Design a protein around this ligand. Sequence first.
Ligand code: CT7
Length: 292
Amino acid sequence: MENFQKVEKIGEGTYGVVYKARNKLTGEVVALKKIRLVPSTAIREISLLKELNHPNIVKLLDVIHTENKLYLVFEFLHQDLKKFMDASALTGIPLPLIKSYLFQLLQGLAFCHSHRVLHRDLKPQNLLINTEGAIKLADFGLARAFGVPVRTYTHEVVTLWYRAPEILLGCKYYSTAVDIWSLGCIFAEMVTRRALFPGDSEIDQLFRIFRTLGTPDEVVWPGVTSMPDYKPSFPKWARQDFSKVVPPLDEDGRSLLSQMLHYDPNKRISAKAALAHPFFQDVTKPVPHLRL
Ligand SMILES: CS(=O)(=O)c1ccc(Nc2cc(Cl)nc3ccnn23)cc1
């Protein structure tokens, strides 16, 4: 740790405090995460992430393990998608910039998923932006290393808002499709300026999903009634049209979102396929003017 001096607090993340810090030797400015005190499988798991390098994944620079505490050192970015969404509230993010962010995050997912690494906890707070019009996913692979707790070290409630229905229904093994579901939620959120499914307990989360997308049944999702927390007594809601959910998103956009929000994870579009969707035929890379 003595190689770093703490510049400021920039978050109470899932596992510990996140600091902007400076490398007292090499001068570099980095994001420094302290991990809630570690077992050997986690060290091996984290270490494999050092190799998982992509322009849309926040680079893991180092892992520091002393007095049985754990520190991850990351590439620093100045701003997350929530702040930027708040900043953009009066007009919303321009659609060309939403499309470019979606397109880059998809490339990031397609890379990690090709290597069988999933995120499991995408949310606007771990989607970080720079002044060059780039966006990057923070904390990829950490939920498998450390688990995803109900509360953070600070007792902050972990959001359910972006959690896929299979996880909420008690599936033991979930796939890369859980990441596509969350990105789809965040897509809808950029377009509407409101969270799609802002649930405030597990059953409120499912019920909000069900209200918008129809209660899932053996027709839309073969095998669902056999899932661990599925109950035959769930209220039976009818699906709404996506024209009602995400105006004024266009037809290609609504088509893409639909396939990212399929109930059956086997049927939900992959990141790779998503990148080929007609929604991206006219994609570009705008710069946001950012206030840092
Ligand atoms: C509110 S914010 O937009 O001011 C802000 C500022 C800085 C950061 N940076 C950041 C925060 C976290 Cl948690 N992890 C990492 C990793 C690389 N940068 N970084 C995030 C959000």
